[PDB]
């Protein structure tokens, strides 16, 4: 039944996201292995990832549905191999840019990885499956992180081997993705109006609009929570205590995602209530991080924020899948991801870039909490307006 494709896809997503080198990516390509200055990693290497993410998300949400979601996943596996192979044996900024390009391809195809399982299972299993899928990915990171940390705090193991373990991990994911069952079958301006027929559910727009905006803020919170912690703790407080909390935080998210998969809840009526409650929870957690000058309170707030958001995004993906009534699973997920990435890029340009506002970290998280509070209030207003 649903078990075979779900188990294979969950194993692929576990072994493709169990990446021990990700927590120590910055030390890896800034230490003695590459000898790359920190200026070149954030101004010439990292933005290539976002650019490639945009220009490779376009083909994904345009082409994934027609190719029936497996070739994009397979392309994701073969882009994992190229990315980590070039990270292993790459020198200089030029090949790091190619690494970032292939990583952008990897994430653009992660969109198709998320859509694939809905393309193959019956709508009756769209809920359970949903959580499970997200769950393994989140859990994968935790495992990788903890493994990496153990492999640094129990074996004195260098980052090169750690990265080759990451490559071996994603190589196994490619072989698992080879075994995925193939989903069954089924001017340019006309295509656009088809998009209109795709969003006519009038319940998907609500969930997609939350997705387009809440993940745009969530990724920025994810990127800058490390800097927030490093700013709210000048005494000791090394990466071990941070990169570690990051793992446990996402572990909670994994549980939350799996919770959506495992509890029998009729999300048709409780979807909007869950959205408003957990969005105000997201806002309260973000304000908890900024306001309190206690790193334990900020850690708890980040755990709450990641857990709440992971549960909410699992509910969003599930409710978009069931209420889609068209085959365009990757079109909606891909468009939602691309719009969120565009919003994230624009708002990080205006708020935190040296040219937009150069807004310092503490009031930057104040801004992020206010943004999530605005999102919560917008959806809270709808419940009042439908009552």
Short mmCIF file of C-alpha atoms in Angstrom, two decimals:
data_model
loop_
_atom_site.label_atom_id
_atom_site.label_comp_id
_atom_site.label_asym_id
_atom_site.label_seq_id
_atom_site.Cartn_x
_atom_site.Cartn_y
_atom_site.Cartn_z
CA UNK A 1 0.00 0.00 0.00
CA UNK A 2 1.34 3.40 1.06
CA UNK A 3 4.08 1.78 3.15
CA UNK A 4 6.54 0.91 0.38
CA UNK A 5 6.90 4.36 -1.27
CA UNK A 6 6.78 6.14 2.10
CA UNK A 7 9.52 3.99 3.66
CA UNK A 8 11.80 4.32 0.61
CA UNK A 9 11.28 8.09 0.39
CA UNK A 10 11.77 8.49 4.14
CA UNK A 11 15.02 6.52 3.93
CA UNK A 12 16.14 8.65 0.97
CA UNK A 13 15.34 11.84 2.89
CA UNK A 14 17.06 10.54 6.01
CA UNK A 15 20.27 9.60 4.21
CA UNK A 16 20.22 12.74 2.04
CA UNK A 17 19.83 15.08 5.03
CA UNK A 18 22.00 13.18 7.54
CA UNK A 19 24.92 15.47 6.68
CA UNK A 20 27.53 15.56 9.47
CA UNK A 21 29.57 18.20 7.63
CA UNK A 22 26.76 20.78 7.56
CA UNK A 23 27.18 22.00 11.19
CA UNK A 24 30.93 22.38 10.58
CA UNK A 25 30.73 23.68 7.01
CA UNK A 26 32.10 27.12 7.93
CA UNK A 27 35.19 25.80 9.79
CA UNK A 28 35.75 23.22 7.05
CA UNK A 29 36.20 25.65 4.14
CA UNK A 30 37.87 28.29 6.33
CA UNK A 31 40.50 26.17 8.09
CA UNK A 32 43.59 24.39 6.76
CA UNK A 33 41.72 22.30 4.16
CA UNK A 34 40.78 25.23 1.88
CA UNK A 35 42.37 28.33 3.46
CA UNK A 36 39.52 30.58 2.31
CA UNK A 37 39.10 34.00 3.92
CA UNK A 38 35.80 34.58 5.71
CA UNK A 39 35.05 37.54 3.44
CA UNK A 40 35.04 35.35 0.32
CA UNK A 41 32.66 32.79 1.85
CA UNK A 42 29.80 35.20 2.55
CA UNK A 43 30.16 37.69 -0.30
CA UNK A 44 31.31 35.53 -3.24
CA UNK A 45 30.34 31.93 -2.40
CA UNK A 46 27.16 31.91 -0.32
CA UNK A 47 25.03 34.32 -2.46
CA UNK A 48 25.64 32.00 -5.42
CA UNK A 49 23.59 29.43 -3.50
CA UNK A 50 20.59 31.78 -3.29
CA UNK A 51 20.85 32.81 -6.94
CA UNK A 52 21.08 29.19 -8.09
CA UNK A 53 18.23 28.32 -5.72
CA UNK A 54 15.98 30.85 -7.46
CA UNK A 55 16.96 30.02 -11.04
CA UNK A 56 16.71 26.28 -10.35
CA UNK A 57 13.45 26.52 -8.43
CA UNK A 58 11.89 27.95 -11.58
CA UNK A 59 12.51 24.76 -13.65
CA UNK A 60 11.45 22.60 -10.70
CA UNK A 61 8.01 24.11 -10.23
CA UNK A 62 7.62 24.33 -14.01
CA UNK A 63 8.92 20.88 -15.01
CA UNK A 64 8.63 18.52 -12.01
CA UNK A 65 4.94 17.67 -12.49
CA UNK A 66 5.39 16.63 -16.13
CA UNK A 67 8.42 14.43 -15.40
CA UNK A 68 6.46 12.67 -12.63
CA UNK A 69 8.66 13.74 -9.71
CA UNK A 70 11.24 10.96 -9.82
CA UNK A 71 13.86 12.38 -12.24
CA UNK A 72 14.05 15.57 -10.16
CA UNK A 73 14.63 13.45 -7.05
CA UNK A 74 17.25 11.42 -8.93
CA UNK A 75 18.77 14.68 -10.15
CA UNK A 76 18.80 15.73 -6.46
CA UNK A 77 20.78 12.58 -5.61
CA UNK A 78 23.26 13.11 -8.43
CA UNK A 79 23.59 16.77 -7.39
CA UNK A 80 24.37 15.65 -3.85
CA UNK A 81 27.21 13.52 -5.23
CA UNK A 82 28.67 16.37 -7.29
CA UNK A 83 28.29 18.90 -4.47
CA UNK A 84 30.05 16.87 -1.79
CA UNK A 85 32.60 15.47 -4.25
CA UNK A 86 33.62 19.01 -5.16
CA UNK A 87 33.61 19.98 -1.48
CA UNK A 88 35.95 17.04 -0.83
CA UNK A 89 38.45 17.81 -3.60
CA UNK A 90 37.78 21.46 -4.48
CA UNK A 91 40.13 24.40 -4.01
CA UNK A 92 39.55 28.10 -4.54
CA UNK A 93 36.49 30.32 -4.69
CA UNK A 94 35.63 29.34 -8.27
CA UNK A 95 34.79 25.70 -7.50
CA UNK A 96 33.06 26.63 -4.24
CA UNK A 97 30.69 28.70 -6.38
CA UNK A 98 29.96 25.57 -8.42
CA UNK A 99 29.39 23.73 -5.13
CA UNK A 100 26.84 26.37 -4.15
CA UNK A 101 25.18 26.13 -7.57
CA UNK A 102 24.74 22.39 -7.18
CA UNK A 103 23.48 22.89 -3.61
CA UNK A 104 20.86 25.27 -4.96
CA UNK A 105 19.91 22.56 -7.44
CA UNK A 106 19.74 20.12 -4.51
CA UNK A 107 17.27 22.28 -2.59
CA UNK A 108 15.19 23.11 -5.66
CA UNK A 109 14.84 19.35 -6.12
CA UNK A 110 14.08 18.91 -2.41
CA UNK A 111 10.87 20.69 -3.37
CA UNK A 112 10.11 17.77 -5.71
CA UNK A 113 11.15 15.36 -2.96
CA UNK A 114 8.37 16.83 -0.83
CA UNK A 115 5.80 16.67 -3.65
CA UNK A 116 6.63 13.12 -4.78
CA UNK A 117 4.99 11.22 -1.94
CA UNK A 118 1.70 13.03 -2.48
CA UNK A 119 2.03 12.11 -6.14
CA UNK A 120 1.99 8.37 -5.28
CA UNK A 121 -0.21 7.71 -2.21
CA UNK A 122 -3.98 7.90 -1.86
CA UNK A 123 -5.43 11.09 -0.32
CA UNK A 124 -6.53 9.03 2.69
CA UNK A 125 -2.86 8.69 3.74
CA UNK A 126 -1.92 12.31 2.97
CA UNK A 127 -1.92 13.23 6.67
CA UNK A 128 0.21 10.47 8.22
CA UNK A 129 2.70 10.39 5.33
CA UNK A 130 3.04 14.17 5.54
CA UNK A 131 4.43 14.18 9.05
CA UNK A 132 6.57 11.12 8.46
CA UNK A 133 8.24 12.72 5.46
CA UNK A 134 9.07 15.98 7.18
CA UNK A 135 9.91 14.08 10.34
CA UNK A 136 12.70 11.99 8.90
CA UNK A 137 14.37 14.98 7.27
CA UNK A 138 14.39 16.89 10.54
CA UNK A 139 15.40 13.79 12.47
CA UNK A 140 18.10 13.18 9.87
CA UNK A 141 19.72 16.52 10.62
CA UNK A 142 19.66 15.82 14.35
CA UNK A 143 21.33 12.45 13.84
CA UNK A 144 23.92 13.97 11.55
CA UNK A 145 24.57 16.82 13.94
CA UNK A 146 24.92 14.61 16.98
CA UNK A 147 27.02 12.14 15.02
CA UNK A 148 29.24 14.96 13.83
CA UNK A 149 29.57 16.33 17.34
CA UNK A 150 30.43 12.90 18.71
CA UNK A 151 32.85 12.38 15.83
CA UNK A 152 34.56 15.62 16.87
CA UNK A 153 34.34 15.13 20.66
CA UNK A 154 35.05 11.39 20.81
CA UNK A 155 37.44 10.58 17.92
CA UNK A 156 39.37 13.81 17.15
CA UNK A 157 38.20 13.20 13.59
CA UNK A 158 39.13 15.81 11.00
CA UNK A 159 36.56 17.62 8.88
CA UNK A 160 37.70 16.02 5.61
CA UNK A 161 36.68 12.48 6.65
CA UNK A 162 33.53 13.96 8.22
CA UNK A 163 32.65 15.37 4.81
CA UNK A 164 33.41 12.05 3.13
CA UNK A 165 31.00 10.41 5.59
CA UNK A 166 28.46 13.02 4.49
CA UNK A 167 29.15 12.04 0.87
CA UNK A 168 28.76 8.34 1.67
CA UNK A 169 25.47 9.18 3.46
CA UNK A 170 24.09 11.05 0.43
CA UNK A 171 25.42 8.37 -1.93
CA UNK A 172 23.27 5.78 -0.14
CA UNK A 173 20.35 8.21 -0.47
CA UNK A 174 20.87 8.22 -4.24
CA UNK A 175 20.67 4.42 -4.35
CA UNK A 176 17.48 4.53 -2.27
CA UNK A 177 15.99 7.13 -4.62
CA UNK A 178 16.76 4.77 -7.50
CA UNK A 179 14.27 2.36 -5.88
CA UNK A 180 11.42 4.87 -5.62
CA UNK A 181 8.28 3.69 -7.42
CA UNK A 182 7.49 5.73 -10.51
CA UNK A 183 4.24 7.70 -10.13
CA UNK A 184 1.49 6.98 -12.62
CA UNK A 185 0.85 9.32 -15.52
CA UNK A 186 -1.26 12.45 -14.99
CA UNK A 187 0.55 30.70 -26.01
CA UNK A 188 2.33 30.30 -22.67
CA UNK A 189 -0.10 32.73 -21.02
CA UNK A 190 -2.69 29.93 -21.01
CA UNK A 191 -0.44 28.09 -18.56
CA UNK A 192 -0.79 31.08 -16.23
CA UNK A 193 -4.57 30.77 -16.19
CA UNK A 194 -4.13 27.09 -15.36
CA UNK A 195 -2.38 28.31 -12.22
CA UNK A 196 -5.60 30.19 -11.49
CA UNK A 197 -7.51 26.88 -11.77
CA UNK A 198 -4.91 25.38 -9.41
CA UNK A 199 -5.44 27.93 -6.60
CA UNK A 200 -9.24 28.00 -6.90
CA UNK A 201 -9.64 25.85 -3.77
CA UNK A 202 -9.94 29.06 -1.69
CA UNK A 203 -8.49 27.08 1.22
CA UNK A 204 -5.09 26.50 -0.41
CA UNK A 205 -4.52 30.26 -0.81
CA UNK A 206 -4.83 30.65 2.96
CA UNK A 207 -2.32 27.87 3.65
CA UNK A 208 -0.07 28.87 0.74
CA UNK A 209 -0.10 32.51 1.86
CA UNK A 210 0.96 31.39 5.32
CA UNK A 211 3.64 29.18 3.74
CA UNK A 212 4.91 31.94 1.44
CA UNK A 213 5.41 34.31 4.37
CA UNK A 214 6.07 32.19 7.48
CA UNK A 215 8.93 30.18 5.97
CA UNK A 216 10.44 33.35 4.51
CA UNK A 217 10.76 34.65 8.05
CA UNK A 218 11.62 31.22 9.43
CA UNK A 219 14.69 30.80 7.22
CA UNK A 220 15.97 34.25 8.24
CA UNK A 221 15.44 33.37 11.90
CA UNK A 222 17.32 30.13 11.22
CA UNK A 223 20.21 31.98 9.58
CA UNK A 224 20.58 34.69 12.22
CA UNK A 225 19.80 32.81 15.46
CA UNK A 226 23.44 31.70 15.55
CA UNK A 227 24.56 35.33 15.41
CA UNK A 228 21.96 36.23 18.03
CA UNK A 229 23.33 33.59 20.40
CA UNK A 230 26.92 34.66 19.72
CA UNK A 231 25.88 38.25 20.52
CA UNK A 232 23.99 37.33 23.72
CA UNK A 233 26.94 35.29 25.05
CA UNK A 234 30.47 36.82 24.66
CA UNK A 235 31.81 34.61 27.53
CA UNK A 236 32.79 31.09 26.30
CA UNK A 237 29.57 29.79 24.60
CA UNK A 238 31.32 28.03 21.64
CA UNK A 239 29.79 26.30 18.55
CA UNK A 240 29.54 22.95 20.48
CA UNK A 241 26.85 24.47 22.80
CA UNK A 242 25.17 26.21 19.79
CA UNK A 243 25.35 23.63 16.93
CA UNK A 244 24.20 21.15 19.59
CA UNK A 245 21.16 23.10 20.74
CA UNK A 246 20.34 23.60 17.02
CA UNK A 247 20.11 19.79 16.73
CA UNK A 248 17.91 19.29 19.78
CA UNK A 249 15.70 22.17 18.65
CA UNK A 250 15.06 20.57 15.29
CA UNK A 251 14.58 17.25 17.07
CA UNK A 252 11.54 18.80 18.71
CA UNK A 253 10.44 19.92 15.28
CA UNK A 254 10.83 16.36 14.06
CA UNK A 255 8.61 15.15 16.90
CA UNK A 256 6.11 17.88 16.08
CA UNK A 257 6.12 16.88 12.42
CA UNK A 258 5.72 13.23 13.33
CA UNK A 259 2.98 14.28 15.75
CA UNK A 260 0.98 15.66 12.83
CA UNK A 261 1.49 12.31 11.14
CA UNK A 262 0.54 10.26 14.15
CA UNK A 263 -2.43 11.93 15.98
CA UNK A 264 -5.93 11.42 14.57
CA UNK A 265 -7.07 15.04 14.28
CA UNK A 266 -9.63 16.37 11.79
CA UNK A 267 -7.51 19.23 10.46
CA UNK A 268 -10.34 20.44 8.21
CA UNK A 269 -11.92 22.43 11.05
CA UNK A 270 -8.90 22.71 13.37
CA UNK A 271 -6.51 23.84 10.63
CA UNK A 272 -7.22 27.55 11.02
CA UNK A 273 -7.33 27.35 14.82
CA UNK A 274 -3.98 25.55 14.75
CA UNK A 275 -2.58 28.19 12.39
CA UNK A 276 -3.58 31.13 14.57
CA UNK A 277 -2.55 29.48 17.86
CA UNK A 278 0.83 28.32 16.64
CA UNK A 279 1.49 31.57 14.78
CA UNK A 280 0.98 33.57 17.96
CA UNK A 281 3.19 30.93 19.60
CA UNK A 282 5.83 31.60 16.90
CA UNK A 283 5.56 35.35 17.62
CA UNK A 284 5.83 34.83 21.37
CA UNK A 285 8.89 32.62 20.97
CA UNK A 286 10.60 35.13 18.67
CA UNK A 287 9.92 37.93 21.15
CA UNK A 288 11.19 35.61 23.90
CA UNK A 289 14.56 35.31 22.16
CA UNK A 290 15.02 39.05 21.60
CA UNK A 291 13.74 40.51 24.87
CA UNK A 292 15.21 38.22 27.54
CA UNK A 293 18.91 38.58 28.38
CA UNK A 294 19.14 34.94 29.44
CA UNK A 295 20.56 32.47 26.93
CA UNK A 296 18.55 29.58 28.39
CA UNK A 297 15.30 31.46 27.80
CA UNK A 298 16.42 32.19 24.23
CA UNK A 299 17.31 28.51 23.73
CA UNK A 300 13.88 27.45 24.97
CA UNK A 301 12.24 30.05 22.74
CA UNK A 302 14.14 28.78 19.71
CA UNK A 303 13.16 25.19 20.51
CA UNK A 304 9.52 26.28 20.80
CA UNK A 305 9.72 28.29 17.58
CA UNK A 306 11.26 25.46 15.56
CA UNK A 307 8.84 22.87 16.96
CA UNK A 308 5.75 25.08 16.41
CA UNK A 309 6.84 26.02 12.87
CA UNK A 310 7.64 22.44 11.90
CA UNK A 311 4.21 21.30 13.08
CA UNK A 312 2.58 24.20 11.24
CA UNK A 313 4.44 23.59 7.97
CA UNK A 314 3.57 19.89 8.13
CA UNK A 315 -0.10 20.84 8.54
CA UNK A 316 0.27 23.33 5.68
CA UNK A 317 1.78 20.78 3.30
CA UNK A 318 -0.88 18.20 4.20
CA UNK A 319 -3.80 20.63 3.83
CA UNK A 320 -2.44 21.96 0.54
CA UNK A 321 -2.09 18.39 -0.73
CA UNK A 322 -5.61 17.23 0.14
CA UNK A 323 -7.35 20.47 -0.98
CA UNK A 324 -5.34 20.72 -4.23
CA UNK A 325 -7.75 18.59 -6.35
CA UNK A 326 -5.23 18.86 -9.22
CA UNK A 327 -2.01 16.89 -9.86
CA UNK A 328 0.13 20.04 -9.50
CA UNK A 329 1.74 19.09 -6.20
CA UNK A 330 5.20 20.38 -7.10
CA UNK A 331 3.77 23.44 -8.84
CA UNK A 332 2.11 24.60 -5.62
CA UNK A 333 4.97 23.52 -3.37
CA UNK A 334 7.52 24.92 -5.80
CA UNK A 335 5.71 28.22 -6.26
CA UNK A 336 5.20 28.49 -2.47
CA UNK A 337 8.94 27.86 -1.93
CA UNK A 338 10.02 30.28 -4.67
CA UNK A 339 7.73 33.05 -3.43
CA UNK A 340 8.96 32.49 0.13
CA UNK A 341 12.57 32.63 -1.05
CA UNK A 342 11.89 35.85 -2.98
CA UNK A 343 10.23 37.40 0.09
CA UNK A 344 13.12 36.26 2.28
CA UNK A 345 15.69 37.69 -0.13
CA UNK A 346 13.90 41.04 -0.45
CA UNK A 347 13.33 41.41 3.28
CA UNK A 348 16.89 40.39 4.21
CA UNK A 349 18.12 42.93 1.66
CA UNK A 350 16.05 45.67 3.25
CA UNK A 351 16.47 44.81 6.94
CA UNK A 352 19.98 43.43 7.52
CA UNK A 353 22.13 44.13 4.45
CA UNK A 354 24.68 46.94 4.73
CA UNK A 355 22.74 48.87 2.06
CA UNK A 356 19.15 48.31 3.19
CA UNK A 357 18.99 49.23 6.87
CA UNK A 358 22.12 47.68 8.42
CA UNK A 359 19.89 46.84 11.38
CA UNK A 360 21.75 45.25 14.33
CA UNK A 361 20.97 41.75 15.55
CA UNK A 362 18.93 42.36 18.70
CA UNK A 363 16.49 44.79 17.10
CA UNK A 364 16.71 42.57 14.02
CA UNK A 365 15.11 39.75 16.00
CA UNK A 366 12.68 42.33 17.36
CA UNK A 367 11.76 42.96 13.71
CA UNK A 368 11.45 39.23 13.01
CA UNK A 369 9.16 38.74 16.01
CA UNK A 370 7.06 41.70 14.90
CA UNK A 371 6.84 40.19 11.40
CA UNK A 372 5.60 36.86 12.77
CA UNK A 373 3.18 38.73 15.04
CA UNK A 374 1.87 40.53 11.95
CA UNK A 375 1.39 37.16 10.25
CA UNK A 376 -0.43 35.84 13.32
CA UNK A 377 -2.69 38.90 13.51
CA UNK A 378 -3.57 38.69 9.82
CA UNK A 379 -4.83 35.12 10.19
CA UNK A 380 -6.40 35.95 13.56
CA UNK A 381 -8.43 38.65 11.82
CA UNK A 382 -9.84 36.13 9.33
CA UNK A 383 -11.27 33.97 12.11
CA UNK A 384 -13.03 37.03 13.54
CA UNK A 385 -14.27 38.02 10.06
CA UNK A 386 -15.73 34.54 9.50
CA UNK A 387 -17.47 34.72 12.88
#
